[PDB]
């Protein structure tokens, strides 16, 4: 009949699809490129801007901009270009025919939701929409009604404790560390070894290096002692021009800054201490049930060994007599989408949508009272 | 008694002297020439290679090489020739008798420091040495404990914010624009007017043209409008063969590429935007005190009007209610040397030196833990 669109704007990858299918059928980076060199050849079909995989393919000649930073949309015309490209080119669906479901990080400005709703109703003319919290959807995705969700994409990291489907909004922690600033840290430490990655394309190369070769040390000091004393830990990677580069302690040393944010120069504690300090904000009767479920979400939680390191140091912080269990399904990179795909297909949810009648009556202000 | 040597390797000029005197008594270009023509006359005392002012005097018959490019030493045997020439010929001091203090740009490879230390201990047998950050020394030189230093030599440009003597290493910005690639840009734009400077000697002629006739426009568009509409702005310069050449808008147009690196085809923003984006990485309590001190250093900051252009567009970027103050002493070309001359003469500093005992015990690896 009619099936909601489910879209998660993220930072980096856009992933979008139809409710009740099991994985997104459009996935592509939320990136806009504009050409920066003087065009010479007449009659080339040269184009004002590129979106997604086009801007990845041509990125040699483009300045690449991300329109979303730390879950905040900084540039609105490029975000409209990314949605226009998503609906018409990637999904090939006219938005007037489908409710749309849109995803956002907690504790970010209200104007972001007001603008997202004003754009979806006024330009796209989407008949109905809703704005959902990223972390809540990871419980739908992992089959649970209870747990403290730890979520990290590109940009924002946040913890949200949930107990039998009630959020605990005084205990929500949010951290801007994850994912992009790991890449801007890797680019800085790689210079030590004599490699220089400055341009926005070289940042995408370093992002691919990070996704392939980084891993989390169980003990960071023992492994730095080992990697100072050996070549055994050292791996080499082939740049797009066929140069070859060799990477030593940097590969484990980059994601350790998740657990020691002082490396990049933040003043806040690692994800393990914000997780524990989030559980400490919950009333003592439920803590037993949060320690028994910790759910990782989003791509920055994909590093090898991050679960066993999390469980090890949370088991160091926690009282001795409890199971600490970290849940990290291999599909977790898509968990927020799979959870929104589940949510948008429920029948109980069909009363939750903001309809255009209500937006016309109450204006974009309505989103705050109707949505979370 | 014994007084440390203070040496700043730079790119282009070497400048060297004794600690606690006020200006370097050896200054000469870090250049090595080798003769390229067939020598005809028997018995001439013809010589395998020339260093410094010798290679400037004979440069008509020489290929000129710079052993340092973008603060990285690319060629080590010529760098050893330049240090051998500095100590024996320029200072006429035996290095075994004096601690040596050596200066480097931030964020450059570690192998450069390991090799510099291995050479100073093993070949020169210098009893003690230290490696100092170029930008840090400009504060010693300008009498301050706080400020964001902007430094540009030949090769590397870098910003380093310092607040009450603590560096902020996550906010250090480094840019490869300055000084040599301005000359390689001037040689390219001068061809437009019908002058061709290809050889390494002609590059030295263009460097002298740049140092005499270039200046920075307050408004680049107004002055291009003026120089299109008049002869008033036009200056003429006499080549070493007594030809005379005439230079128009090129003279302001060359150093504008410091503020618009897209001219040479870089993808990064000008020195004013890297200065502002460096202050934006500092915590909000100190920004007021960085805007109140900006310290220019190194010869590429000598262009007329570069201070008032910097202050004008930084005052455009900054919030309206703050003093922006640019500090640009007329001596700033020597500031890194004067600062190292101050530093090496402190009494507290006499425990900082790496001694040969420690190099023998720990090997050249020590430099990373003992030095910055």
């Amino acid at each position: 009949e009619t099936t909601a669109l489910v879209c998660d704007n993220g930072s980096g990858l856009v992933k979008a699809g139809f409710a009740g299918d099991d994985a997104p059928r459009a996935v592509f980076p939320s990136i806009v490129g504009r050409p920066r060199h003087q065009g010479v050849m007449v009659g080339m079909g040269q184009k004002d801007s590129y979106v997604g995989d086009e801007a990845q393919s041509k990125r040699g000649i483009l300045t690449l901009k991300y329109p979303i930073e730390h879950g905040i949309i900084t540039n609105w015309d490029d975000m409209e270009k990314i949605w226009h490209h998503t609906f018409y080119n990637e999904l090939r669906v006219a938005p007037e025919e489908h409710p749309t479901l849109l995803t956002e990080a907690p504790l970010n400005p209200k104007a972001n939701r007001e603008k997202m709703t004003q754009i979806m109703f006024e330009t796209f003319n989407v008949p109905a929409m809703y704005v959902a919290i990223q972390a809540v959807l990871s419980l739908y995705a992992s089959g649970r009604t209870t747990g403290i969700v730890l979520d990290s994409g590109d940009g924002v990291t946040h913890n949200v404790p949930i107990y039998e489907g009630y959020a605990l909004p005084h205990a929500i922690m949010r951290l801007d560390l994850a994912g992009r600033d790991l890449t801007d840290y890797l680019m800085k430490i790689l210079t030590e070894r004599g490699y220089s990655f400055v341009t926005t394309a070289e940042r995408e190369i370093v992002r691919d290096i990070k996704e392939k070769l980084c891993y989390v040390a169980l003990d960071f000091e023992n492994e730095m002692a080992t990697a100072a004393s050996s070549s055994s830990l050292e791996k080499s990677y082939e740049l797009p021009d066929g140069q070859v580069i060799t990477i030593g302690n940097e590969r484990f040393r980059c994601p350790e800054t998740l657990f020691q944010p002082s490396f990049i120069g933040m003043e806040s504690a690692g994800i393990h201490e914000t997780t524990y300090n989030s559980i400490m904000k919950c009333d003592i009767d439920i803590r037993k049930d949060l320690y028994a479920n910790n759910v990782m979400s989003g791509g920055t939680t994909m590093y090898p060994g991050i679960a066993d390191r999390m469980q090890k140091e949370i088991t160091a912080l926690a009282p001795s007599t409890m199971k600490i269990k970290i849940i990290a399904p291999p599909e977790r990179k898509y968990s927020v989408w799979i959870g929104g795909s589940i949510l948008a297909s429920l029948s109980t949810f069909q009363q939750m949508w903001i309809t255009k009648q209500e937006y016309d009556e109450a204006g974009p202000s309505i989103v705050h009272r109707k949505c979370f | 008694e014994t007084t440390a040597l203070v040496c700043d390797n730079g790119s282009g000029l070497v400048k060297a002297g004794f600690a606690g005197d006020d200006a370097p008594r050896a200054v000469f270009p870090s250049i090595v020439g080798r003769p390229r023509h067939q020598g005809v006359m028997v018995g001439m005392g013809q010589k395998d290679s020339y260093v410094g002012d010798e290679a400037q005097s004979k440069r008509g018959i020489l290929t000129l090489k710079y052993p340092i490019e973008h603060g990285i030493i690319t060629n080590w045997d010529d760098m050893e020739k330049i240090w051998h020439h500095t100590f024996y010929n320029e200072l006429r001091v035996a290095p075994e008798e004096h601690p040596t203090l050596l200066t480097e740009a931030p964020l450059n490879p570690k192998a450069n420091r390991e090799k510099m230390t291995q050479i100073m201990f093993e070949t020169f047998n210098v009893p003690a040495m230290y490696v100092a950050i170029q930008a840090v020394l400009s504060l010693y030189a300008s009498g301050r404990t706080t400020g964001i230093v902007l430094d540009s030599g030949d090769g590397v440009t870098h910003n380093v914010p310092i607040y009450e003597g603590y560096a902020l290493p996550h906010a250090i910005m480094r840019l490869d624009l300055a000084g040599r690639d301005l000359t390689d840009y001037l040689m390219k734009i001068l061809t437009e007017r019908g002058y061709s400077f290809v050889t390494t000697a002609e590059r030295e002629i263009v460097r002298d043209i740049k140092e005499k006739l270039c200046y920075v426009a307050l408004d680049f568009e107004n002055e291009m409008a003026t120089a299109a509409s008049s002869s008033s702005l036009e200056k003429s310069y006499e080549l070493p063969d007594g030809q005379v050449i005439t230079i128009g808008n090129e003279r302001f147009r060359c150093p504008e590429t410091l503020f618009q690196p897209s001219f040479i085809g870089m993808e990064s923003a000008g020195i004013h935007e890297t200065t502002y984006n460096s202050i934006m990485k500092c915590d909000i309590d100190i920004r007021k005190d960085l805007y109140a001190n900006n310290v220019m250093s190194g010869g590429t900051t000598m262009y007329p009007g570069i201070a008032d252009r910097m202050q004008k567009e930084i005052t455009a970027l900054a919030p309206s209610t703050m003093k922006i103050k640019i500090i640009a002493p007329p001596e700033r070309k020597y500031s890194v040397w004067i600062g190292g001359s101050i530093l090496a003469s402190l009494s507290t500093f006499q425990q900082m030196w790496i001694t040969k005992q420690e190099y023998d015990e720990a090997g050249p690896s020590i430099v990373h833990r003992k030095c910055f």
Partner: peptide, 7 residues
């Protein structure tokens, strides 16, 4: 953002 961080 609008005050603290850059976005």
């Amino acid at each position: 953002w609008x005050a603290x961080c850059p976005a």
